[PDB]
Structure formats: structure tokens, C-alpha cells
Design a protein around this ligand. Structure first.
Ligand SMILES: Nc1ncnc2c1ncn2[C@@H]1O[C@@H]2COP(=O)(O)O[C@H]2[C@H]1O
Ligand SMILES: Nc1ncnc2c1ncn2[C@@H]1O[C@@H]2COP(=O)(O)O[C@H]2[C@H]1O
Lengths: 200, 200
């Protein structure tokens, strides 16, 4: 991918250990990132410091793009390393020059923005239309749809903690545990340690 | 704006009467739109066909952009004229050519995508974190912030139906009615037929 190589040749790459915060909500935005290796969580917080996970981003994803198109923006969310990460960084002004040179790099970034808006909109609908059981169920389905989900003779299998499910749906880890027990009883799912099979 | 004029010279413009649906969820996406005049609502539905309003778009806004960056996409939402509209239309293929010619047109589109993702993310946090009252109240404030809100000696005045407020916050028209009554009692707002005076 010559496009990617050319873009990256203009970035400076930095390593972030698991759990480190790459981006703090409210900081002034002047730089774009790209995940060469690793995975991160994008999250927001309520007034009680409870975190919610808006998105998981991985190798190939841009981050910190939302301040690119208007100056004086603040970072709209926190971004925290789930794994150890290699992350390329580049100033907004330099990136703008790259765009004038070859707009395919902006098309790639924008393609990701479009996907993120589609998925985030779906999350709005889930939060507004479903009760807690429905939200948890739909989250299990969505995770069953991820590339890293592994086939199972009963359905599709995923790994994730009660805590993480809770951070995605907006509930406590306890509530999540009770609801997963129910879905197991209704023979819709199966549970293990940190492994779940979704029947479908 | 010469960049906008240039762009428009490549579009074909069409008129849509109030209430007409410009875009149906699920259609195959191959064309981009731009609102020369008028305003529209972007909405989604539950399985029972209740509608929720994700966004209001106006003169200057692109629409139907989400299918641009990958082929074989379906329209992610319904878009319906709130007023009568003049809307420019152009094939994705042709728009891609325009981008190669002058990427500023893609920068404009992408600036809107970025704003939409920021605001939609905030909506996720509101649904997750606030109760129907914090939500209804905040919605009243937001509408009080709109350019079409008219000054009042008590505060700022807006017009909108219980039904519409409910479609924005994700609750029934009845629930909305009861909550507005409460906010009237707490002397935070005043009500009329389809008119509300947000105090302060
Ligand atoms: N809803 C979302 N979906 C995916 N990524 C997001 C979302 N909201 C914020 N982000 C990412 O969080 C980043 C942190 O700061 P920025 O606002 O500069 O750019 C942001 C986006 O890259
Ligand atoms: N969350 C949103 N905020 C603003 N506009 C949206 C949102 N979700 C969908 N739209 C618009 O609805 C359009 C309908 O089809 P597209 O998916 O082609 O492109 C879409 C966007 O223009």
C-alpha cells in the first residue's frame, strides 16, 4: 500500500503501553494519529465518573481526526490503549498539505468517519428503543458480528468481560451478570469464564 | 463561494415539497445531495415504526454522503423534508472526479461529517446518562439556542409539538406532556398550544 507508506513516512511513530491515555477529552486538538499496531477504546464520562465505551479502534484506524476541519477544537472524547500500541502522529497542517498532494488519504480517513457515524447512530437507536435486556442482547449480537468472533457449532463465540459489556451498554457489571444469566436460561446464549457463545 | 458554485454547476437541482421523503433507509446508495434551500430531518425507526430524529439539516448541508467511500452501501437513515426544499444531486462517480480536481470540496463535506459525529456522540452520552427529564429539559434549552427562537420577556420562545419533542428525546408524546406540565409547575417553563417559553 504505497499510499499508506507515503502517509506514514511523514508521521512520527510512538509507543504507548497498555492502559495509557493517548487522548484526553478537552485538550486542544492539533494532531492526527493512526494506529500502526494495537487497539484502543474511545470513551466518554458521566458526571459520576462512570465511563462509557463509544468505540473500539484497531490497526489501520485514524484517531483524533475530529478537530481537523476547524481550528480551536477540543478533543471530543478520551482514547485509551487496551493493548500496547504503535501510533503514528502528524500535525493537522502537515496532513492538510498531504491532502492537497493526494486526496486519497482524506478519502480513507473520511471512509472511517462515515462508518463511525453509521455505527454511532445505530447505538443511539439501541439506547432509545431498547430496554436493558435488549441493549445487552444487541451488544452480544454486534460483537458476534466482529471479525475476531470465532465460529462455534451452536453459534458465534466472543470473549469479553462483564465489566466491558457494562461499559458498552451503560450498566453495572452486576446488572450485566444477572442479565447474562437470564439469557443463558432462555437458551439464547452460553457463558464461561470470559467467553460467551451467542446462538446465531 | 466559488468552490460551492463550481460544485453546484455539476449537480442537477430538484425541488421536494414539504413532507416528501428524499432518502429511504435501505435504498442502494450511489448519489450525494446538497441542500441549496430548505430543511430536512434525518430519522431512524424501531421495529414498531416509531420514529426518532437523529439530526436536522439545513441550507449548506450535504446529505446522503455516508455511502460515498465504499460501494454497495445502503442508506443508513430516512431523510424527510420539513420545509419545501431545493436539493442539488450528483453521482458518487462524478463527485469523486470533482475531488481529484479540487479536494476542498471533500474537506467541506468531511467537516460536516466531523460535526455530525461529535453531536451524535453527545446524543449517545445523553441517552446513556440522563433521565427523560434531564433530556427533555436539555432539548428545550437546545431549541432555545436555535436561530429561529424568538426573544421573550421571560426567556426564549420556541414552537414545537409534544410529538416532535418526543421524537427527539426518545419518549412518548404522553410522557412529554406530563414532564412539560412538571417543568411548568417548577416555574422553569411556560406552555401554550404549540408554543413554549423557556424562562430565564
Ligand atoms: N462516536 C465515535 N466513534 C468512533 N470514534 C470516535 C467517536 N467519538 C470520538 N471518537 C474518536 O475520539 C477521538 C478523540 O479526539 P478528537 O475529537 O480529536 O477525534 C476523536 C475521534 O477520533
Ligand atoms: N447521525 C447522523 N447525523 C447527521 N446526518 C445523519 C446521521 N445519520 C444519518 N445521516 C444522514 O442520513 C443520510 C441517509 O443515507 P446515507 O447513509 O447515504 O447518508 C446519511 C447522512 O447524510
Amino acid at each position: 500500500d504505497p499510499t499508506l507508506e507515503w502517509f506514514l513516512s511523514h508521521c512520527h511513530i510512538h509507543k504507548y503501553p497498555s492502559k495509557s491515555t493517548l487522548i484526553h477529552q478537552g485538550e486542544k486538538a492539533e494532531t492526527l494519529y493512526y494506529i500502526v499496531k494495537g487497539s484502543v477504546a474511545v470513551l466518554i464520562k458521566d458526571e459520576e465518573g462512570k465511563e462509557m465505551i463509544l468505540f473500539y479502534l484497531n490497526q489501520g484506524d485514524f484517531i483524533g481526526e475530529l478537530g481537523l476541519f476547524e481550528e480551536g477544537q477540543e478533543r471530543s472524547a478520551w482514547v485509551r490503549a487496551k493493548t500496547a500500541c504503535e501510533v503514528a502522529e502528524i500535525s493537522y497542517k502537515k496532513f492538510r498539505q498531504l491532502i492537497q498532494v493526494n486526496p486519497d488519504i482524506l478519502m480513507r480517513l473520511s471512509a472511517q468517519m462515515a462508518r463511525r457515524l453509521q455505527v454511532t447512530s445505530e447505538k443511539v437507536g439501541n439506547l432509545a428503543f431498547l430496554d436493558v435486556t435488549g441493549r445487552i442482547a444487541q451488544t452480544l449480537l454486534n460483537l458476534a458480528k466482529q471479525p475476531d468472533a470465532m465460529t462455534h457449532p451452536d453459534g458465534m463465540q466472543i470473549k469479553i468481560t462483564r465489566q466491558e459489556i457494562g461499559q458498552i451498554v451503560g450498566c453495572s457489571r452486576e446488572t450485566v451478570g444477572r442479565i447474562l444469566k437470564m439469557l443463558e436460561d432462555q437458551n439464547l446464549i452460553s457463558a464461561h469464564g470470559k467467553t460467551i457463545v451467542v446462538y446465531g
